[PDB]
Amino acid sequence: KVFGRCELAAAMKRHGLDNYRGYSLGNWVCAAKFESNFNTQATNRNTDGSTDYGILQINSRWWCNDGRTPGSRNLCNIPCSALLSSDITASVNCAKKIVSDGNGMNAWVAWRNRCKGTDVQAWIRGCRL
């Protein structure tokens, strides 16, 4: 599914991401924009053989099982396929674990490089929330 900007802001708020670990909703919308362009079916293969899945491009080295990332973990206890669903529940619940890991949203390199310290409230401007 390709979400609209405000549609995704709403879904993320519905699932308790807004101000989760102190990160405002605009930070999460911005991260999703640059990770996936709001496409739940986004995938990206890394040089190490791991794969990133879904609207927040969650990686198979730690967070989900895809059966093809040797030595990896599955700390979200889900198949990586769950991260490609039109229903963002699995992505949001797994993102809550990731952002709790110690480095906050710096775990998403695209957030650090493209969203951190910018006027992220622009990402929810106009939205009925």
For residues 11 and 110, which CB has a smaller minimum distance to Cl ion in the complex? 11
Grouping H, G, I as helix, E, B as strand and the rest as coil, residue 76 is coil
Residue numbers at the binding site for Na ion (CB under 5 A) = 60, 65, 69, 72, 74
CB of 46 to Cl ion, least distance (A): 14
Contact set with Cl ion (CB under 5 A): 5, 11, 24, 26, 65, 67, 69, 72-74, 79, 87-88, 104, 121
Catalytic residue among 35, 48, 66, 119: 35
52 is catalytic: yes
Q: Is 21 left (phi over 0), alpha (psi -120 to 50) or beta?
A: left
d(CA 44, CA 52): 5
- Residue located via tokens 């053989």: 49
Minimum CB distance to Na ion, residue 41 (Å): 19
Q: Does 101 count as an annotated binding residue?
A: yes
* Residue 59: CB minimum distance to Na ion, A: 8
C-alpha–C-alpha distance, residues 76 and 102, integer Å: 16
Cβ atoms of 104 and 7 within 8 Å: the answer is no
Q: Mind telling me the catalytic residues?
A: 35, 52
